[PDB]
Every structure is written in C-alpha cells, then in structure tokens.
C-alpha cells in the first residue's frame, strides 16, 4: 500500500494532457501528528477540572500533609467521594448523585491490609460501605522514587518518526500535580468492580477480584466511545522470564 | 601516605550507593543500575565511620550464605535503625525494618551467585518472610473480611446528596498555562510503575507469586477498548 | 553542532529559519592548509595534450578570494536540500539527509538546464580500498 | 589526533609501500560508535529549543 496516487488533467478538446503523482506519506503523517496534539489536550484539559474542583474545596494545606496525618475521618472521606463522582460524570455525564447510603471505613492496621486492591466494598449489608488503607496510600505516595523524565521510545524508522523535530495558592511543583494521577487511576480501578458488582450479583464480584481476567466479556456494550486512561498502551514487560 | 583513593570521590561514592540503595529499598525510578566497583566501594565507604560499620557487619552476615534472619539486638538494632534513617538522609520517611530486611534479601541474592553475564531479572521473592509456610490469598481472604464486617464505620458521613464544582473559567486557564510544560507521557510512568511495585510491597507475607499474567488482562484492558471500539 | 553539513533549514515552524555552525566555518577558515604549488594530472599528451602545450585601496590578494568558493559550494550543497524539501515532502527531506545519493532521480527533469561549478570531471580517490 | 596518528605508524613493521589512509581514530572518549540517528534526534530537539 505505496499508493503512488497518480493524477491527470485535460485541456477541453482534448488537445494534450498532463500527468503528475503524490504520496500520502507526508499527509498521513500530519494527520497523526494532530490526533495526538489533540488528544493530549483534552487529557491535560481534563486534570486541569479535576484539580481545580478539588482546590475548591478549602484544604488548609497542600495534599500529602493529609494522608501524612491520621486523625481526619472528613478529608479523606471526601477526597475518594470526589474521585468516584468525577469517574461516574466522566461516564454518565448527566447524573450527579448516588442516592445516599456512601460510608467509608478508615483501615489502619496491617491485619486489616489486603494485597492488590487498596479499596474494598461490601455492597449491601443492609446498605453500601467501602474501605480504605491510608497506610498503604501513603506508601504508594512514597514520593521519593520519583526523579527526571527519561526519553525512550523504541520501533523507530527515521525522521519518517522524528519529524515533529521540524513540525514546529498552590503555584506548585508538576510532580507533586503528577502524583494525583496515581489516585486517579486507582480509584478508577476501584471504579470498575464497584460497577460490576452494582449491575450484577456477589459471586462474580469475587471472581473479578480472583481474576481481572474475565471481566473483558461484561465490560462490552458498556463503553460507547467513553474513553479511559489508557492511551499509551505499551503496558508490557519481560515476558520469558517468568520460567514458570 | 597517600589518603586520596580511599575516600577522594567521596562524592561519587556516597551519590552512588545511596542512588542504588534507593533503586533498591526505595525501587526508585529506571536506571542502568550497576557497577561491580562500585559493589566494593560499597564496603570501603563504610570502612570509615562506626555508624557504617554496623551495618557493614550485618551485610557482611550474608556472606554466610544461609537463608537465617540474624537475632534482633533490640536496643542496637534500633540504634542502628536510626544510624541508617541518618546515612540515607531521608526525611525521617518511616524508613523501617520491613526495608531493612528487604535489602537483607537483596544482597541475599546479590552475591550469591558469580553470574557473569546479566541476571537482568527481577527476584521478586524473599525467603525471609515471615514465614515460608507460604499460604495462599483464599484463606486471607476470609481472615480479612471476618474482621471487615466486623467493625464500625469511624464516621457516618453520607447524609442526602451534593455536587462540587466551580466555574473560574479565566482562573482554569491561568492554571492550565502554569501546567503546560510538563512531559506528562513520562512523567506519569514512574507512577504508574509505582503503583505496580505496591504489590509486592503490600504482600510481604506469605505471599502468592502469581501476578503477571492478571496485570497482562490489566493492560488488555486497552484490548478490550478497542475491540469495544471495533465492536 | 552537526555531522556533514554546516548549516541547515527548519523550513516552516510557523515560518522558515536558519542555523548555521560558526565554529565550524571557522574551522573552514584554518586556511593554513592552502599551498599553490602543485601539479596537475595528465595523461596521454602526445594525443591529449602536446597540442594545447602550444598555445598562450583594496588591491586585495587571491588566497582568500579562492577560499570563497569554499562558502560558495557548501551554500550550493545546502540549497540544493532546500529547495528539495520546499517543493516537496519531509519524508524526502528524511531522505536526501540519510544520504544525498538518489536525489538525483527528483533533480531529473527539475534541473534548469543549466550547468553550474562542476567542471572538471574527476572528483575521486581510491575507492576498492574501503577494506571492509 | 596526532598521538593516534604516531600510534598507528609504528604500528606497520612495514617497509613495502602502503596504500592505507588510516582515516579512522580508536579515541572518540566511548566505548563504541553510534548510529548518527541518535544525533540527528538529540541536536534537532536542543536545536527546536533555540530561539
């Protein structure tokens, strides 16, 4: 798929003609270029809200502090609620609330800790309730590990990939902005099995949380063109090593 | 004499360990993290002060080889505590034994073997849990959820229904051009790797080896999407 | 600065611009190298060339004169790329720059018919001798 | 470069008449060559970075 598209043009009459020929290559490129200018916009558009409709929200002090802390039951209640709001308007962009019965537990025990998912729920005892590990929060902000942007990429041709090198009061720190995504994408998680267990029964819930692996056939008929936050999707690994 | 090859980069001694003590308890960011000389230099930057020589001593332990987890000289044992919260110059960030023993398992594998080539490979398992009895996630399971649904909500916060929002729109912006410079396409990754360690760093108990293969459905989860996308 | 070329074109971000290696020109300048007293090839005289054996304030001096054609060929070299990429695609701007080479093929029914600063005709070394 | 040029003359215990332009130098301060892709990534982005 060359696509030497090839081209002619005609005097009226039919005296003589003219012929001349193109390639894609350089229009397909720009339009590549555009798509991913565009979409990084909207996502840097939407952190933006999201940031800015927490910041409403009166905290005396910046992030960290909070979770540093131990004695709230307000704050950190109403950070996740706020979470699972802007999620649920990210999908259903027309509903607002859910009805009551929300209640969250604060965990702050290692023998109440569980591995893997840091936000659990027990939907109907009556009523809903969640819990929370605010340790494991904390470690998962050890922010230390962070550190300068690495630049890698990998599959590259030539500037037939580098060409965009010639395609043309919480004042704070991008890092500290960074770490909310991790938040973000946690609670979206959470989000997830929150849903199926909301549409369908107990068991299943269970074996989502043995498995998040066979949720890909009831996660169907259920992302209209919502998109979600995976859109560098090279999320992969050292595969062979695992030797069994 | 001549001082100077003991000590005269100390500057990339210190820098060096502590960079790779930090790959290693605090799994920092990616790197090309080796070099063997610097492996001993190690050892000789510790061979200058009391409050390295303690923990030059217990690393020394490993070259025992065998998998026992060395008696707890309590008052010590803390005391040295604080000597490495000190020498890892960290903000008092609740550096703890659990790490501790962590880099224990660490060197545990380090030495032990004369691979001469590349083990570019995690070894994401320590035998110095607490205990290799290794159980599975099932019966944690239920041990967790008993005492789940046995406690009480520390505070009874949903009452009727509200939304938050604002409206600055002038204010956003002035916000979004603070934020624009920002690789985010890297930035984020460190995250999200984070968010992977957590795992482990949860699970130093017992723990159940398998993870890969549900983080590869986690990343199918784009799969899906598309095919989703595609019908 | 950059391998092979001493100058090089961004030709619109937003509008066309220019950068250029002035340590390397200089490097250029280290006319030192420059000595007349040479002697040219030949061959075949008695056929070729023993018939044309029989035939005949700023007063500034040559050296430096004859040094411009250095700036001339470089600035020659770089429009051609320029030209090359302002008519037609970055992809051939990708190529032309990964090797100069095939050019030649676009430069085909695009030169002007006119000749320009390659007289004469060898401009070679060894070449077999690349003993890989 | 003159050091390189004396450590490759000697280098010939060879009297016969050598037609070999040693262009080359081992001393490039690395390990090994790069492509120049690399560069023509590294100084096109510092260069886009210029004002």
């Known amino acids: 798929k060359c696509n030497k598209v090839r081209t002619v043009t005609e005097i009226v009459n039919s005296d003589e003609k003219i012929q001349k020929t193109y390639e894609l290559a350089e229009f397909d490129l720009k339009n590549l270029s555009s798509l991913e200018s ?4 909207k996502i840097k558009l939407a952190l933006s809200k999201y940031m800015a409709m927490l910041s409403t929200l009166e905290m005396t ?17 109403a950070v996740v609620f706020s979470t699972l709001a802007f999620i649920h308007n990210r999908f259903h962009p027309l509903v607002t609330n859910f009805t009551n019965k929300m209640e969250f537990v604060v965990t702050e025990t290692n023998d109440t800790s569980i591995p893997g998912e840091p936000i659990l729920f027990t939907e109907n005892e009556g009523v809903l309730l969640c819990s929370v590990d605010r340790p494991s929060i904390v470690k998962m902000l050890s922010r230390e590990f962070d ?11 030539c500037n037939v990939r580098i060409a965009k090198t010639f395609g043309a009061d919480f004042s ?49 008929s259920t992302m209209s063109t919502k998109t979600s936050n995976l859109l560098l999707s090279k999320f992969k690994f050292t595969i062979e090593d695992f030797d069994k | 004499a001549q001082p100077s090859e003991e000590l005269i980069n100390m500057r990339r001694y210190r820098n060096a360990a502590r960079k790779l003590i930090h790959h290693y308890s605090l799994n920092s960011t990616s790197s090309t993290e080796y ?64 790490t501790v023993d962590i880099m224990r398992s660490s060197f545990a594998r380090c030495f032990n073997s004369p691979i001469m080539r590349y083990a570019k490979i995690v070894l994401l398992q320590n035998v110095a849990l607490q205990r290799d009895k290794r159980t599975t996630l099932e019966e944690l399971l239920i041990e967790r959820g008993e005492k789940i649904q046995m406690l009480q909500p520390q505070q009874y916060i949903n009452s009727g229904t509200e939304i938050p929002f604002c409206d600055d729109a002038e204010f956003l912006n002035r916000l979004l051009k603070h934020i624009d410079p920002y690789p985010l396409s890297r930035m984020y990754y460190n995250a999200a790797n984070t968010m992977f360690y957590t795992t482990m760093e949860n699970y130093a108990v017992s723990n159940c080896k398998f993870n890969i ?3 590869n459905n986690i990343f199918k989860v784009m799969e899906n999407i598309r095919k989703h996308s595609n019908k």
Do not use: W
């Open chain 1, 38 to 41: 565009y979409e990084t916009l």
């Open chain 1, 147 to 157: 550190t300068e942007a690495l630049v890698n990429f990998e599959n590259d041709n």
């Open chain 2, 213 to 215: 293969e549900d983080y």
């Open chain 2, 35 to 98: 070099k063997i000389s610097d492996v001993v230099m190690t050892m000789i930057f510790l061979l200058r002060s009391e409050k390295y020589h303690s923990l030059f001593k217990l690393l020394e332990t490993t070259f025992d080889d065998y998998t026992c987890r060395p008696q707890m000289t309590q008052v010590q044992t803390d005391t040295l505590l604080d000597a490495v919260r000190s020498l890892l110059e960290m903000p008092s960030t609740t550096i703890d034994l659990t």
């Open chain 1, 172 to 220: 704070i720190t991008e890092v500290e902005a960074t770490q909310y995504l991790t938040l973000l994408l946690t609670v979206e998680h959470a989000y997830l099995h929150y849903y199926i267990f909301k549409n369908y029964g107990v068991f299943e819930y269970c074996k989502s949380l043995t498995d998040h692996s066979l949720f890909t056939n009831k996660l169907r």
């Open chain 1, 61 to 77: 002090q910046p992030l960290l502090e909070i979770f540093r802390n131990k004695a709230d039951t307000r704050q950190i209640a």
